[PDB]
Amino acid sequence: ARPGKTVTGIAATLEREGKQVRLGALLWFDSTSSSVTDMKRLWLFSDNPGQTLEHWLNVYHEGGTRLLRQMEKEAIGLWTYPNKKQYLARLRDFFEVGENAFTLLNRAAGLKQLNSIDEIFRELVLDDHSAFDRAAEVANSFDGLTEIHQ
Amino acid sequence: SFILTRIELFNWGGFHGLHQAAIHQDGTAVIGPTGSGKT
Amino acid sequence: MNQVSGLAGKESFILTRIELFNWGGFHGLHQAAIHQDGTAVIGPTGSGKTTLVDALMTLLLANPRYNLASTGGHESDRDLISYVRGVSGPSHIARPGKTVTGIAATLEREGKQVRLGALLWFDSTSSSVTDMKRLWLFSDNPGQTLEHWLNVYHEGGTRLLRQMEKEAIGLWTYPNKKQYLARLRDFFEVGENAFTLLNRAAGLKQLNSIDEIFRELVLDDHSAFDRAAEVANSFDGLTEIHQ
Amino acid sequence: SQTVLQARARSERDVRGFMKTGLAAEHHRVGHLLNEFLNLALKLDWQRQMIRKQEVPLPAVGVAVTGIPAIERLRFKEVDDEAEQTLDLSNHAADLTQIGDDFWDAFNGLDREVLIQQTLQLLAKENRPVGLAELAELLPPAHDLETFAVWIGMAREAGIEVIDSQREFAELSDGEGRRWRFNLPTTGLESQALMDIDWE
Amino acid sequence: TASLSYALSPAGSRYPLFGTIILDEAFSRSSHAVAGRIIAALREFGLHAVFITPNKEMRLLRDHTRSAIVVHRRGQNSNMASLSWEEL
Amino acid sequence: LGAKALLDPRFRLEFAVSVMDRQSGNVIESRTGSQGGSGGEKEIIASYVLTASLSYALSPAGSRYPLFGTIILDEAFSRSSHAVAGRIIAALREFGLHAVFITPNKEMRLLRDHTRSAIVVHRRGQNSNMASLSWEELERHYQRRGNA
Amino acid sequence: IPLEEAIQSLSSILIEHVSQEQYDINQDNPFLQASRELREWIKRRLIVER
Numbered sequence: 008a009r010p011g012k013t014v015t016g017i018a019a020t021l022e023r024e025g026k027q028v029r030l031g032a033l034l035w036f037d038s039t040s041s042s043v044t045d046m047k048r049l050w051l052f053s054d055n056p057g058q059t060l061e062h063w064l065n066v067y068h069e070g071g072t073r074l075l076r077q078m079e080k081e082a083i084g085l086w087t088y089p090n091k092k093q094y095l096a097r098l099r100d101f102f103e104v105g106e107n108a109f110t111l112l113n114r115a116a117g118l119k120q121l122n123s124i125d126e127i128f129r130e131l132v133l134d135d136h137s138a139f140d141r142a143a144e145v146a147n148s149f150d151g152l153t154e155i156h157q
Numbered sequence: 158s159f160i161l162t163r164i165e166l167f168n169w170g171g172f173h174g175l176h177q178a179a180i181h182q183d184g185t186a187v188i189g190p191t192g193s194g195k196t
Numbered sequence: 197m198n199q200v201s202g203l204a205g206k207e208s209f210i211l212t213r214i215e216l217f218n219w220g221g222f223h224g225l226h227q228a229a230i231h232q233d234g235t236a237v238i239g240p241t242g243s244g245k246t247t248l249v250d251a252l253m254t255l256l257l258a259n260p261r262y263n264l265a266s267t268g269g270h271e272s273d274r275d276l277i278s279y280v281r282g283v284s285g286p287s288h289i290a291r292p293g294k295t296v297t298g299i300a301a302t303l304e305r306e307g308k309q310v311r312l313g314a315l316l317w318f319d320s321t322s323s324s325v326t327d328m329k330r331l332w333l334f335s336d337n338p339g340q341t342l343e344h345w346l347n348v349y350h351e352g353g354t355r356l357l358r359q360m361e362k363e364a365i366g367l368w369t370y371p372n373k374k375q376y377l378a379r380l381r382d383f384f385e386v387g388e389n390a391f392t393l394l395n396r397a398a399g400l401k402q403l404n405s406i407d408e409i410f411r412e413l414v415l416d417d418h419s420a421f422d423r424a425a426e427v428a429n430s431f432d433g434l435t436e437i438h439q
Numbered sequence: 440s441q442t443v444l445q446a447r448a449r450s451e452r453d454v455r456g457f458m459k460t461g462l463a464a465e466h467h468r469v470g471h472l473l474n475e476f477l478n479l480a481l482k483l484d485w486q487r488q489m490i491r492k493q494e495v496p497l498p499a500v501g502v503a504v505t506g507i508p509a510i511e512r513l514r515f516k517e518v519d520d521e522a523e524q525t526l527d528l529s530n531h532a533a534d535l536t537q538i539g540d541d542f543w544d545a546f547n548g549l550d551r552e553v554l555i556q557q558t559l560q561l562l563a564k565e566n567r568p569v570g571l572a573e574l575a576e577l578l579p580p581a582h583d584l585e586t587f588a589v590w591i592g593m594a595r596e597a598g599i600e601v602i603d604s605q606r607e608f609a610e611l612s613d614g615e616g617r618r619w620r621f622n623l624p625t626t627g628l629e630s631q632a633l634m635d636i637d638w639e
Numbered sequence: 640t641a642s643l644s645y646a647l648s649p650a651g652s653r654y655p656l657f658g659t660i661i662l663d664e665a666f667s668r669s670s671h672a673v674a675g676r677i678i679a680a681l682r683e684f685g686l687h688a689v690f691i692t693p694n695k696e697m698r699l700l701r702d703h704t705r706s707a708i709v710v711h712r713r714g715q716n717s718n719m720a721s722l723s724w725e726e727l
Numbered sequence: 728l729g730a731k732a733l734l735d736p737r738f739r740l741e742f743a744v745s746v747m748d749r750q751s752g753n754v755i756e757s758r759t760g761s762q763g764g765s766g767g768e769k770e771i772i773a774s775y776v777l778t779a780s781l782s783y784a785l786s787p788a789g790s791r792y793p794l795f796g797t798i799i800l801d802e803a804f805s806r807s808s809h810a811v812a813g814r815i816i817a818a819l820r821e822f823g824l825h826a827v828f829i830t831p832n833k834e835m836r837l838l839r840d841h842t843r844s845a846i847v848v849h850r851r852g853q854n855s856n857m858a859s860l861s862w863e864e865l866e867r868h869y870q871r872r873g874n875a
Numbered sequence: 876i877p878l879e880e881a882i883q884s885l886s887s888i889l890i891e892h893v894s895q896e897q898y899d900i901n902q903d904n905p906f907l908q909a910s911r912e913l914r915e916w917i918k919r920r921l922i923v924e925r
């Protein structure tokens with residue numbers, strides 16, 4: 008539908024006892040190029056109710072990214088993260104939960120395979136701290152020492 | 158606890174122009190024909 | 197719409213009947229009559245509908261994909277021995293000792309009835325496949341029924357059932373499953389691959405792309421990994437000689 | 440303690456690196472030279488900025504000439520890219536009527552709580568077994584087959600006896616008037632066995 | 640459905656010699672219209688069909704079928720019942 | 728399997744689930760070794776345990792209440808009956824979770840029984856439009872359609 | 876602490892101490908201040924990151 012120059016928007020919102028929180032994003036292409044790195048991103052985080060995806064898109068069309076970060080600085084209760092890791096760090100700080108929480112939420116959101124229980128745990132429930140690479144490193148060190156001995 | 162009631166969504170998926178969801182904090186469902194934009 | 201269903205019966209044997217005895221949760225005797233035009237099966241979840249479906253596929257294939265609907269291509273939790281043992285998920289075994297389980301189905305093409313059968317029994321309390329004793333029945337005789345076969349088995353061992361087949365017209369029986377399956381395939385003039393595809397359909401579920409549809413659901417692989425292994429071993433012998 | 444083991448393995452790495460030095464002649468000469476140079480390097484004051492960025496007399500090899508400044512290689516911004524896209528912030532609202540009839544029919548599905556309440560009340564007032572046909576006549580179902588299933592469901596849930604071989608029939612008109620004839624199992628719904636069971 | 644119908648038809652037969660097809664969880668992941676089209680395709684292939692459902696899409700099955708089998712379980716025991724309907 | 732059993736911690740353990748008597752240590756249930764293959768019970772068990780775990784992860788330490796109450800779910804309800812689906816909704820609410828249920832136009836009745844609002848989505852070719860409603864407005868629109 | 880999480884939490888903490896006017900208060904960008912302080916404390920060998 009939008010192969011050429013375009014702008015895309017997303018904005019969720021939640022509240023607890025009459026206080027707003029709003030997760031935002033913007034994704035626009037300056038041309039038809041559609042490679043992953045070509046995607047120009049600008050994440051947004053704001054609790055000020057006046058902020059809306061409509062307002063962000065209006066500001067974008069009026070100016071651009073240069074104006075957007077200026078809007079964040081001039082604005083209050085708003086933030087902008089030109090990268091995602093910082094954005095998600097902020098979000099995890101606000102909700103005071105580790106990344107494992109969100110990742111498990113997403114894993115559960117589409118759980119349809121829904122197989123025997125043992126697979127539910129190992130796959131979805133439990134964070135991963137396997138020890139394959141470390142065993143490989145131990146073997147490497149032992150082989151090097153054996154090389155010295157030989 | 159915070160409860161999600163909104164989705165302002167623009168030029169995303171099969172959603173041209175602006176769209177808006179109003180999920181309800183009291184318990185909600187979202188429904189549409191196969192291939193309608195739920196997922 | 198359903199008028200074409202009768203045309204299918206003219207063109208083909210359509211299956212509408214079931215006789216059961218102590219299969220899974222279906223303890224004692226139970227039976228079902230089915231409409232030629234098509235049918236449905238219903239009930240609360242975890243009540244025995246997929247158990248009945250598996251009951252059907254046990255008669256038709258050497259090995260089905262038990263409860264393939266639940267798994268989605270993954271290994272079945274159940275099998276013939278569990279169903280005949282009345283497993284319920286860990287008293288959880290309804291039939292621990294020497295017991296019997298009978299299952300059968302009926303069909304019709306142009307008014308001509310054909311009934312398949314399977315008399316199962318443990319003569320032991322152990323639940324191994326070896327302890328899993330069985331007899332399979334193919335019938336062009338309408339008068340032969342799962343109740344009759346159950347009664348004959350109650351009279352005595354398999355020798356009474358085979359003797360009954362010899363005495364009975366239009367009946368065949370096979371204490372070896374593959375003979376029964378070969379008889380069924382010969383009757384229907386189609387290879388077992390059709391029944392394997394039917395079983396895949398019995399638990400038809402998700403996939404990820406059009407290519408996967410063909411590759412998994414449609415076709416049979418017969419990949420040549422064994423050929424590669426033997427080729428590699430023979431070439432290793434050749435390498436020995438060359439060295 | 441794992442952290443220490445990492446350092447020990449790291450050190451064994453360099454031990455292994457220095458074990459293999461049975462160099463060829465030219466390799467051996469350059470190895471002597473490089474070890475001498477590196478020893479000389481340690482004594483420099485690396486932390487200082489100016490030490491690091493001092494030039495060295497190493498000769499230029501692999502030299503590449505580039506960026507020949509021909510004026511004819513110049514090209515200029517072209518403004519044909521100005522094709523504008525409208526900001527369509529309008530609300531692309533929905534149209535409820537366009538939704539298929541099947542959606543509404545599912546939206547009309549059989550409600551089990553109301554059906555349970557009504558059936559229990561009817562059977563309580565009737566204070567006797569009531570077959571499925573009798574219930575259909577006494578209570579015109581909306582989703583006829585849905586209510587048949589749910590009625591047999593309560594029957595089995597209460598353990599009420601059922602015989603499937605002996606039969607009985609009940610006729611009903613559907614939502615569009617077309618009439619149907621059912622074949623049904625003989626049984627009698629008894630109220631007392633039903634109220635004693637919880638339903639959801 | 641196409642592959643199964645084609646496989647079940649002996650050599651040169653435009654229609655199967657075994658027309659029954661089983662579908663457990665018939666339409667657990669589909670809408671009403673899609674399931675209707677599925678049954679229409681089955682009609683195109685002239686196959687007798689069996690659908691299983693934990694009380695979903697009763698509208699479609701009632702519109703498209705002519706009989707039902709009831710499944711219920713009390714404790715470790717289960718039993719069935721037979722039901723049918725026809726158009727007058 | 729052996730490599731994971733050795734170097735992957737969790738595979739060193741077999742996970743089992745059971746159903747406990749509220750008032751006592753009495754236990755009759757076990758989902759381990761032999762899953763039972765129940766076509767409805769496995770689904771409810773998995774969804775329940777997943778909801779509990781997800782709530783625990785979502786709740787900042789100390790608090791028994793998740794801070795991000797929203798959860799997303801799907802046709803696990805379709806695999807579930809009406810009663811077990813109601814059990815699912817009850818458990819989800821009890822763990823402090825507000826939820827959003829997606830389904831392709833079916834199992835309406837129990838949703839209406841145990842949910843307040845709904846959203847409808849359209850497909851009009853290569854386009855989709857969606858509106859938010861309360862159950863009662865949808866019911867009134869159904870009545871309008873039924874009249875004509 | 877993962878560095879991004881650490882710096883975000885630090886920028887949150889420093890904001891609490893803007894009330895402590897008696898020592899430096901960042902007038903315009905607390906996040907920059909937190910990043911600078913993490914750099915500085917790495918420079919003093921107070922915190923080593925790997």
Ligand SMILES: Nc1ncnc2c1ncn2[C@@H]1O[C@H](COP(=O)(O)OP(=O)(O)O)[C@@H](O)[C@H]1O
Pocket residue numbers: 170171190191192193194195196831850853854855
């Ligand atoms: N890769 C895709 N395949 C099919 N449809 C897609 C795809 N990408 C976007 N779409 C658009 O977005 C929608 C995605 O399908 P969707 O209806 O959300 O799945 P579901 O039926 O499970 O809810 C489609 O209706 C379509 O308009």
Ligand SMILES: Nc1ncnc2c1ncn2[C@@H]1O[C@H](COP(=O)(O)OP(=O)(O)O)[C@@H](O)[C@H]1O
Pocket residue numbers: 220221240241242243244245246247248274278279282283284285712763764765766767768
């Ligand atoms: N052969 C069996 N093996 C293991 N568990 C069984 C077996 N038969 C019945 N059960 C139990 O009895 C019920 C059978 O219902 P079932 O048809 O298998 O599930 P569904 O209707 O969802 O497909 C299940 O709740 C299951 O726990």
